Ligand binder design. Structure first.
Ligand code: NA
Ligand code: NA
Lengths: 314, 311, 325, 308
């Protein structure tokens, strides 16, 4: 007597991106055509105020739901500012191949040509697509299906902000879904990370590189209890002499230091001079995404060679 | 006769001593009378305010003479955009200043430095380069210092502007396409002629679960200005906002930039009322250059904000 | 004291409608007054009025319509009651109309071309914001003298540099090499002024013309031939634009067809199928009057070639136009 | 021991005898080569494509060939690369390479391009990736790449699909494409001497039906239309396309935009004016020629356009 449709659960982390989560759901009635949609409010914060406590709660809830036969896929609604941080964390900690799609809107729900309704519809379409199984955590905005591993927010305000210059999208939407790429990095069900038994994460802070910078921010991070530091270096993870003094001091005090880049794209490569002093390379992870992997790495090991190996596979 | 172009070197060679650079690209002799000097010799992460003052003063002196038609500065790529934008605000001439580097070492297969240097000299000597602002020339592209950034760690095509494109491109001949709308060079209100140091400005990065303690440390270290590389449109966590508000109360100017890479950071009523300023379309490290220079003129947040909308 | 902005509607997706709100590629036809009433916020930034010029999908915009549109725009901008114009148009051939107007509008007052990638009925339809922003730009004092502009997705592109780069996405209109004249983030941020001659400063007028010289476009590919050149000449082409591989390159067969067209008095311009970059002069091709399209893609090169042929058949004068416009 | 990499040259040298020009290659491969043809890339034709695919298929069947590099002019490089992606029945790497600057120019890009092409062709992880295009430290799929700029060194790109990988000293593989290719395709051309004729017609304002009519008269078996936007036709172009279909020609609507998918449109699909998916006109031509070696059924041809 009923139409068979996928069971998609929306987990909201902030306000409504289209139009409570119950209403959010009624603002995009088109979703009923393609899913049996249900919803829950996890937390309710602006994305700059998403923190490690919330991430642990969110990953645990997703893992619980996806283990059930009554949930086919999940859509997480989230503020765009830090969406990429949450999406990549879930990419490393969700231990299921069922789809998890993270979505937001660049224009408020009340704005002229608000982008939330289409984004949400498309997120639910992807989350219920059989072919979305096994693709890793996905970010869906503006008719594009991006991997959490490769995507970033590239522009402050534009609808088309989430992109990957060098890796493009997993797929795109033009009425139908077109899947184009599968990523090569390890993810989701295949990672070595679990947050099932964790109530906190190792502290990791980020320091920026620039002309005439110093060592004082490294020293402050160490004093504040950082277990890891990601440095957003100029170019290919480069450090001034002052920054390198700070990084070396941190390493000597037992902090793991990973060199990322402030440029936005490309790989940070191992460099003999840096590698021999355990100033690690972030691969193609930007500073905030490198932080997520470093926190998780530090739950498993303090060995710099093992952490570097994670940065090449995840 | 040909334009007289002076090369000021700040690092190692990008092609083939400053005499070595010139000899490595003999083709330059057909488009300019090239001479050169070594200003400093450092990796670009070690370019600092002292060096920038020296470089700006030397450039301003040289461009005032009739024997110099234009200048090329050879520089490491990592912080090239910081130096280029600083010079865009402090060189008080319409004569061309072109910043150039290479992404591959001069000894590598298919080294890019020889072409880059040749093109930089071609642009520096082009009459239509007059009045364009400071330019950055790599990989057949002519970018404004105001809009360009290094977007990729290692690729030859790294210097770009997604939203503003290039001032021009080269395909044998130079094709000039755009003139920027921001105030620059000859028309700025900044002078560093008599300065021996610049107001200290530090940069703090925004991220989930960040804090106030890095703001506190920058203030303790003597920052006069702080640029915050905020997520999205210059957004702050509650903790970051506590740190920023603390800094403003201690007389530090705080400018919100973005970590995203592109777009404008807009004035936001909640932030603006608390003097947490907006960086416009300046990224953190370029915002830092304008904030340092603004602080040579004023501590008034409304005046500093107006500079961020015009420069 | 608000600017007086006239909307001239021509058709396109922005005036299209489907009964399914989730259809972005299938749709049926909305009137200019409906477009306006759908965006009441416009009343706070302009005094808006509208007229329907034509009502067609943009692949059916033709030279007759362009002439009508350019003449109407020129007459309206001569009045003190009109501060700026917005043209609503289908996206498919928007760049052709925009660049034509960039060469034939004899005023420094703003002309902004706008469309949408989703129909008016779609969820998160993009037309309302695009239209608001087009009106905002057309009424901005700083938009004066910028050349014809194309406004979609919070971006303000020059007609000379923009193209439709994607079949279906909202962010399709871009210039990889030249970027945008400006962008919108609440306020307008003007960033660039183009260097090419435009609008009031061109040598072209269409005030006395009822038709344009026929120009056709031929595409380059492996195993192509001469017979499509021959067919374009037979069909009455006065000019041909060749969308060559790479930097306006021709196969031997294509070069045979081009050379035969030139011998019959047709002007041939080499453009590129790549999408970006400059088609440079080439000594061997220039000696045979196979001209270079500069940074004009095939369809935009066609617009300039048609107007050049209203002034001259001299290949050196035509080439000079391609370098300045 | 090092992989055995064979270089098939189609024209002039892109570097500098290549081993002399780029001696670093000796440390990463045992290189050999041959001059299979000697033409400018605008004059690569169907006869040459068939010769190249037959020769590559033969070579890769040998146990002592680990991978192939083809040096090729950049203008039509994407056409050859995609054809080989559909016809090389092996998982071993085939890498197509060119240079945007002449070998004699300042900062010639060919030496690095060639070195990287050989590095990729010998990399174990390049197996099963489909035909690759390697220029400017980037590793692009033949299925997604195009030449996007007339003259720049960074011209080969895919805005929407990115690269299969990139090179920064080491190779970083990032994506595997989802379309069917190489070892898994249903196309076999080793015994064919010609391919069904396919021509391309451009869409623009004030276009007509005359070019369609001429292509049909010239013997086209298929026509790719480089339509404005999402494979759109003017009324005049549509009349020409419908005339062609009635005369037994298969018509595929591609796009002149450069990116995105051309979607099936009900009114066009009802009339067998097919959709090219995310294939540009010149790449859609290669798939249509091969489709026409198997069938004239428009539904089957459309299905090929959705999978390849
Ligand atoms: Na450097
Ligand atoms: Na349309």
């Amino acid at each position: 007597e009923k139409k068979d449709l996928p069971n998609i659960r929306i987990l909201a982390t902030g306000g409504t991106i289209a139009g409570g989560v119950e209403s959010l759901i009624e603002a995009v009635p088109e979703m009923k055509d393609i899913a049996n949609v249900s919803g829950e409010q996890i937390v309710n914060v602006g994305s700059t105020n998403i923190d490690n406590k919330i991430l642990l709660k969110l990953a645990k809830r997703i893992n619980h739901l996806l283990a059930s036969d009554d949930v086919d896929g999940i859509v997480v609604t989230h503020g765009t500012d830090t969406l990429e941080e949450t999406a990549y964390f879930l990419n490393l900690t969700v231990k299921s191949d069922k789809p998890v799609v993270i979505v937001g809107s660049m224009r408020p729900s009340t704005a002229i040509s608000a982008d939330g309704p289409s984004n949400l519809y498309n997120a639910v379409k992807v989350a219920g697509a059989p072919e979305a199984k096994g693709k890793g955590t996905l970010v869906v905005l503006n008719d594009r299906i991006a991997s959490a591993r490769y995507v970033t927010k590239t522009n402050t305000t534009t609808t088309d902000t989430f992109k990957s210059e060098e890796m493009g999208f997993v797929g795109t939407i033009a009425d139908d879904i077109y899947f184009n790429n599968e990523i090569t990095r390890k993810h989701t069900k295949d990672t070595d990370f679990s947050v099932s038994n964790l109530d906190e994460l190792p502290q990791v802070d980020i320091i920026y590189g620039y002309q005439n910078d110093g060592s004082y921010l490294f020293d402050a991070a160490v004093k504040a209890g950082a277990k890891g530091i990601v440095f957003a270096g100029s170019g290919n993870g480069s450090l001034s002499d002052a920054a390198e003094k700070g990084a070396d001091s941190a390493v000597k005090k037992g902090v793991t230091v990973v060199r990322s880049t402030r440029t936005g794209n490309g790989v940070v490569t191992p460099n003999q001079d840096y590698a021999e002093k355990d100033l690690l390379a972030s691969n193609s992870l930007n500073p905030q995404k490198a932080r997520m992997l470093l926190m998780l790495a530090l739950t498993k090991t303090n060995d710099p060679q093992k952490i570097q190996a994670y940065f090449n596979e995840y």
